[PDB]
Write an enzyme that holds these catalytic residues in place. Sequence first.
Site, PDB file in Angstrom:
ATOM      1  N   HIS A  82      37.292 102.893  63.580  1.00 25.84           N
ATOM      2  CA  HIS A  82      36.342 102.794  64.677  1.00 25.84           C
ATOM      3  C   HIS A  82      36.361 104.084  65.486  1.00 25.84           C
ATOM      4  CE1 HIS A  82      34.499 101.401  68.430  1.00 25.84           C
ATOM      5  NE2 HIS A  82      34.051 100.348  67.773  1.00 25.84           N
ATOM      6  N   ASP A 107      45.295 100.284  65.811  1.00 19.14           N
ATOM      7  CA  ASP A 107      44.129  99.716  66.478  1.00 19.14           C
ATOM      8  C   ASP A 107      44.058  98.256  66.046  1.00 19.14           C
ATOM      9  OD1 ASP A 107      41.635  98.907  67.383  1.00 19.14           O
ATOM     10  OD2 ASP A 107      40.513 100.300  66.105  1.00 19.14           O
ATOM     11  N   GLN A 138      40.707  94.231  66.128  1.00 17.35           N
ATOM     12  CA  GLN A 138      40.019  93.265  65.291  1.00 17.35           C
ATOM     13  C   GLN A 138      40.980  92.366  64.521  1.00 17.35           C
ATOM     14  OE1 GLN A 138      36.613  91.757  65.029  1.00 17.35           O
ATOM     15  NE2 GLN A 138      36.413  93.967  65.391  1.00 17.35           N
ATOM     16  N   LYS A 151      37.545  90.065  72.512  1.00 16.55           N
ATOM     17  CA  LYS A 151      37.440  89.588  71.138  1.00 16.55           C
ATOM     18  C   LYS A 151      38.249  88.330  70.874  1.00 16.55           C
ATOM     19  CE  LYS A 151      35.963  93.903  70.069  1.00 16.55           C
ATOM     20  NZ  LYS A 151      36.385  94.229  68.681  1.00 16.55           N
ATOM     21  N   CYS A 200      29.866 101.710  65.195  1.00 18.21           N
ATOM     22  CA  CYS A 200      30.779 102.669  65.775  1.00 18.21           C
ATOM     23  C   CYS A 200      31.741 103.180  64.706  1.00 18.21           C
ATOM     24  CB  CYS A 200      31.569 102.096  66.955  1.00 18.21           C
ATOM     25  SG  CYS A 200      30.587 101.550  68.303  1.00 18.21           S
TER      26      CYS A 200
HETATM   27  C1  PDA Z   1      38.386  97.926  65.366  1.00 14.37           C
HETATM   28  C2  PDA Z   1      37.837  98.176  66.765  1.00 14.37           C
HETATM   29  N1  PDA Z   1      38.458  99.051  67.585  1.00 14.37           N
HETATM   30  C3  PDA Z   1      37.981  99.281  68.827  1.00 14.37           C
HETATM   31  C4  PDA Z   1      36.853  98.612  69.256  1.00 14.37           C
HETATM   32  C5  PDA Z   1      36.301  98.868  70.648  1.00 14.37           C
HETATM   33  O1  PDA Z   1      37.282  98.630  71.608  1.00 14.37           O
HETATM   34  P1  PDA Z   1      36.696  97.945  72.979  1.00 14.37           P
HETATM   35  O2  PDA Z   1      37.188  96.516  73.082  1.00 14.37           O
HETATM   36  O3  PDA Z   1      37.104  98.753  74.200  1.00 14.37           O
HETATM   37  O4  PDA Z   1      35.191  97.939  72.856  1.00 14.37           O
HETATM   38  C6  PDA Z   1      36.225  97.737  68.439  1.00 14.37           C
HETATM   39  C7  PDA Z   1      34.981  97.024  68.958  1.00 14.37           C
HETATM   40  N2  PDA Z   1      33.963  96.949  67.931  1.00 14.37           N
HETATM   41  C8  PDA Z   1      32.683  96.672  68.561  1.00 14.37           C
HETATM   42  C9  PDA Z   1      32.195  97.886  69.357  1.00 14.37           C
HETATM   43  C10 PDA Z   1      31.683  96.289  67.472  1.00 14.37           C
HETATM   44  O5  PDA Z   1      32.026  95.475  66.572  1.00 14.37           O
HETATM   45  O6  PDA Z   1      30.527  96.797  67.464  1.00 14.37           O
HETATM   46  C11 PDA Z   1      36.707  97.504  67.191  1.00 14.37           C
HETATM   47  O7  PDA Z   1      36.081  96.602  66.326  1.00 14.37           O
END
Ligand code: PDA
Lengths: 410, 410
Positions: free
Chosen positions: B121, B198, B201, B224, B361
């Site tokens: 991401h 990270d 998810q 989430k 993203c």
């Molecule tokens: C693997 C991963 N890392 C980091 C983030 C973003 O962190 P935040 O909670 O601060 O947004 C996301 C969010 N995805 C979103 C943007 C999506 O599925 O479109 C994510 O799926």
Amino acid sequence: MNITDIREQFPILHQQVNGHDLVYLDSAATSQKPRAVIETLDKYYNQYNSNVHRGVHTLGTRATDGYEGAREKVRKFINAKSMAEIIFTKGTTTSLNMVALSYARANLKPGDEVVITYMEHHANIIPWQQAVKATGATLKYIPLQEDGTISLEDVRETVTSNTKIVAVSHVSNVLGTVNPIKEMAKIAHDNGAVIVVDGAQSTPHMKIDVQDLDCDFFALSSHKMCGPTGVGVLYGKKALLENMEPAEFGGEMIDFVGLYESTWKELPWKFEAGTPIIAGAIGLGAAIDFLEEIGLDEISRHEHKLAAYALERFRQLDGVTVYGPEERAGLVTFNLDDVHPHDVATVLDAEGIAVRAGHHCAQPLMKWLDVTATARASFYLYNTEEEIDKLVEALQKTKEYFTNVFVDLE
Amino acid sequence: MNITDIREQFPILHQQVNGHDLVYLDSAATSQKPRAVIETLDKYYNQYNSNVHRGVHTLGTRATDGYEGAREKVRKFINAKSMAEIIFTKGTTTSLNMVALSYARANLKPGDEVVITYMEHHANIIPWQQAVKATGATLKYIPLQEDGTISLEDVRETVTSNTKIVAVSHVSNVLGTVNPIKEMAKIAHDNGAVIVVDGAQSTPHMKIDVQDLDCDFFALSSHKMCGPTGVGVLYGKKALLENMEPAEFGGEMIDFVGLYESTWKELPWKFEAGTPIIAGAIGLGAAIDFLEEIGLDEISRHEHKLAAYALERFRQLDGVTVYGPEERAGLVTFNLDDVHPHDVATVLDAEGIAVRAGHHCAQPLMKWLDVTATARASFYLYNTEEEIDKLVEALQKTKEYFTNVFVDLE
Ligand SMILES: Cc1ncc(COP(=O)(O)O)c(CN[C@@H](C)C(=O)O)c1O
Ligand SMILES: Cc1ncc(COP(=O)(O)O)c(CN[C@@H](C)C(=O)O)c1O
């Protein structure tokens, strides 16, 4: 402005604490929320919660509309020119840090001066300390007059042609001072500097006009102005925010992302990395609607009423020292002769009265006052004169009690 | 695990969108909240809202207890050793940025390597880009296998003795991949590097054991995992967090503040500048209680059920390309032959089905997939097999419609 009608909007007020009716006098630490804000949050999570700027579905559209409409309400509320100048942040501390970050990382050289004041909240002190450390610049303090106000001539003498940032509070969380933000902004511009207003303690209680103040940056916190915790606002002049680099990086702030290089979005989203505080910002917009419907000038009149009343009743107690000017934003920081402020706060809470005790995140000011700690009672639009009566009665009772305990020493 | 009983806990699910029953399949962008979370927020703002670490009054004590008890629940939830390793942040993006900040500002020299992956991401890409830019270090990418997984040998060959940070996703928001975080952490430690997971998810859908994973940092987002927006968590190994300098400065993180110098607090508050996200963190603790009472392994079983079901039903549609492995976290990113994903998402929303369309993203991954955009449907613990049936029926109907519109071209 009927204040019974307003108090009936805040469910938290209608409870008892330690057998006594709650008297909340700590709004300067955080404010309470009306039904409108809590029910805004409820409606969000019950009906149209979704991420915004991503999915292109109906609930996503409703949530995006709510979030950006909150941005527009914030823009109107402080008379900013463009929504691009309105950046949602975690709070005032984070906004000040973001200015400290992109200034330090790109516009500070040795010999440049950052000038602040002795009354500044820690949030408006340490970022500048660290920035001048990282850049080799110089940190200067504007001295205070003996009534806790700032003289314009001390400003003019302290800010020189080498100053790039003047950072100053709009309203002091300790002294109650309202600083001459407009004249100070003019003086800073005369010296070629920007001005950063910590408006954390002014925004809840008085009208903000960033055009009239001509501030270059303005920082505010939602949790003080009847809004949700965890959200605040950075206002910067669009021209300045265009040339500042982002403090955070990630989704929602990029345009193109390569393996090694990326380009940013246009304002405001350039400065909003990640999923934003959607519910918090929509609730802050609700808080703004609530205040505007009450009327900010009516809130100012009410707070001046309560502050004059509190000052007059405090001078009716012997052995109490009140700090700061007579002209104030409606908060009273004080001490009792031979009673520690923490003890005062404890006895007041046993009477159901909520005050703060300590340094109020203003250690340099405490040292300047020549005290190690203080007690503070802070008023807002749900607070009554009866509550200040209760406060001063409990202060008299506290001092009688500690005299009738000093005497009982054999 | 009765899923009707669980769905009855989410009021947002029981509505119609554009005439059709809502089918929310965009939980990977943000999740919905059960009554327990919304009512936790309501109880906070109705009964014991106050700032925490400041006033020493009853409502302040209740709020402090709630906030730090939420911290302890987060500690238990991911099996951290100490609450000092649990830092409340704005979200996963901010936590990753905080690691990127104190690493770059103090532990990166030229020649050092930061290695990531092509599936990351943007939140787990750009901070490292900017950090290697500021420090002169080198950014490396771990290549992916043709099924969208990571080979351990590619990791071992890409991470060298000059690597200080390996940064990797736990679960891919696009491919559904579950990465071998434990083996990768071992390999990074063998090369003297730290590992930054990270877990944005993974945390909502599967049990986290930071001791078993031996990750040095772990980042997660509350919105989430059925929790409030605007709050997330950074976990760092206590030994590492002691030696990292704060990313933000202000109140609540200082001990002593002088005119020019300050000392910080002990962990965790060293990394929590300003008034914290009180309500948001207490609601996140409620979300954690909710999940633990449902059981994380039951949620994993349910998601594997839905993902296998979705994969099998997608292979029953001709002209649909699904990206990523067969073994996955339960999300399906895909495309329709000769139908643009944005159009797919629009037609699905007209049927009341909520999916995302775009690059999610993850632009480098999109380029790696040799597509410019994609559609994605994401499942969570309130989603049913009937909903995936509805999705695949609407996909078949969409493709029939665009064939019966291609034909109508004179
Ligand atoms: C693997 C991963 N890392 C980091 C983030 C973003 O962190 P935040 O909670 O601060 O947004 C996301 C969010 N995805 C979103 C943007 C999506 O599925 O479109 C994510 O799926
Ligand atoms: C003038 C001022 N600036 C900045 C802040 C802190 O910004 P946050 O909204 O992020 O906390 C405060 C809060 N004061 C609190 C701490 C008090 O009155 O004790 C403040 O009064």
